[PDB]
């Protein structure tokens, strides 16, 4: 059950949801497995926020174990398209898809909590059918693999070769280690 | 069904749910298994209360049997980040994550009812796959154990060696016994 909060202004009292109240403050939540229904919801929020103030930054909280590649790219393209900078904050865990959307934030505005965990790996998939069809899907997923690595290297600042070798299998990176790799810029510990 | 209560104010009477009414009094409820969905809900409540009054303490009730570690490390990082002290009151049961989130409260503002039970154990996991991947996942879970063991020693005051010898297997502690280890500070029995 989502609790209801009150917002006091000189227009009248308005009762808001905890999630809806934070949306007014340029805060978007990315929770759970990434899929098409939730991805389109996040996309709608981004387009709505830039209408109110296309100059202020948009905060995106990422706590997810990963998800569909297509759904994530929808959010990635939307982030890099809108004029305002998207600040990514990692709380809890950030998997392959969560990490890609984490490092995709604006340079210098990517944060991670001290006990947060990050994971990166190559995309998964599979297809059952004729051999000719398998080759079609086999080449398609490979293109995505290379495309994701190229984008990952661009934001992290690493070389494409290093990303491929490191993403060959699961690689767990803590908050201090993610800073060296380039997935994030700083770590938030206390409110200073 | 959640009962609805009324609150009398100068502007007039307003109807809110029981949980929302208590939220106005800086009271957050942590019930059931810990997951990403409920964790983000608690994080939002903590952030909302901080903005309203960053100098008033926050009360967090803990009647949970445990859950995901990552979901519980976001709440912990959020409590240590916000300026106001987060008081923790154990109500009935406090497992690994609940106890970890019970001793993480502000020193001097931790409580445990007289007939409450606290249980501390080591992180549980498991992975199925190639031996190379098993090693990667095995090393990571061993880091979380050491990381969580160190945080508990800092908040309880016990030596790291003792925590390692006491968390190897399930350790049940009553409220009077928790006061001697450091998980809590005092026991609430009556109003005065």
């Amino acid at each position: 059950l989502v609790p209801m909060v009150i917002e006091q202004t000189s227009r009248g009292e308005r009762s808001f949801d905890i999630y809806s109240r934070l949306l007014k403050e340029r805060v978007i939540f990315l929770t759970g497995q990434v899929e098409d229904h939730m991805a389109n919801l996040i996309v709608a929020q981004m387009l709505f926020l830039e209408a109110e103030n296309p100059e202020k930054d948009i905060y995106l909280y990422i706590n997810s174990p990963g998800g569909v590649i297509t759904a994530g790219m929808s959010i990635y393209d939307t982030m890099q398209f809108i004029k305002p900078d998207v600040s990514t904050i990692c709380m809890g865990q950030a998997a392959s898809m969560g990490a890609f959307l984490l490092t995709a934030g604006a340079k210098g505005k990517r944060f991670c909590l001290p006990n947060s965990r990050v994971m990166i790996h190559q995309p998964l998939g599979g297809y059952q059918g004729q051999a000719t069809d398998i080759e079609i899907h086999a080449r398609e997923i490979l293109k995505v693999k290379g495309r994701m690595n190229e984008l990952m290297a661009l934001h992290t600042g690493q070389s494409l070769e290093q990303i491929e070798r490191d993403t060959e299998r699961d690689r767990f990176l803590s908050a201090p280690e993610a800073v060296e790799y380039g997935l994030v810029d700083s770590i938030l510990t206390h409110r200073n | 069904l959640v009962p609805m209560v009324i609150e009398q104010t100068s502007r007039g009477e307003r109807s809110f749910d029981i949980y929302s009414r208590l939220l106005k009094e800086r009271v957050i409820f942590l019930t059931g298994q810990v997951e990403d969905h409920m964790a983000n809900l608690i994080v939002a409540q903590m952030l909302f209360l901080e903005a309203e009054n960053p100098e008033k303490d926050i009360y967090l009730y803990i009647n949970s049997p445990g859950g995901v570690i990552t979901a519980g490390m976001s709440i912990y990082d959020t409590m240590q980040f916000i300026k106001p002290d987060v008081s923790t009151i154990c109500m009935g049961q406090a497992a690994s994550m609940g106890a970890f989130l019970l001793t993480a409260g502000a020193k001097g503002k931790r409580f445990c009812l007289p007939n409450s039970r606290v249980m501390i154990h080591q992180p549980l996991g498991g992975y199925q796959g190639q031996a190379t991947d098993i090693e990667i996942h095995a090393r990571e879970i061993l880091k979380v154990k050491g990381r969580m063991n160190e945080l508990m020693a800092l908040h309880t005051g016990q030596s790291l060696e003792q925590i390692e010898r006491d968390t190897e297997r399930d350790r049940f502690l009553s409220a009077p016994e928790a006061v001697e280890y450091g998980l809590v500070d005092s026991i609430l029995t009556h109003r005065n």
Binding site: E13, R14, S15, D17, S20 | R11
Partner: peptide
């Protein structure tokens, strides 16, 4: 003696509107 007299005001209230998830 020329002296002015004040008058009360409308005394309007501030209504509230509640919003639910759906």
């Amino acid at each position: 003696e020329r002296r002015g007299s004040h008058l009360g005001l409308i005394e309007v209230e501030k209504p509230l509107y509640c919003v639910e998830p759906f």
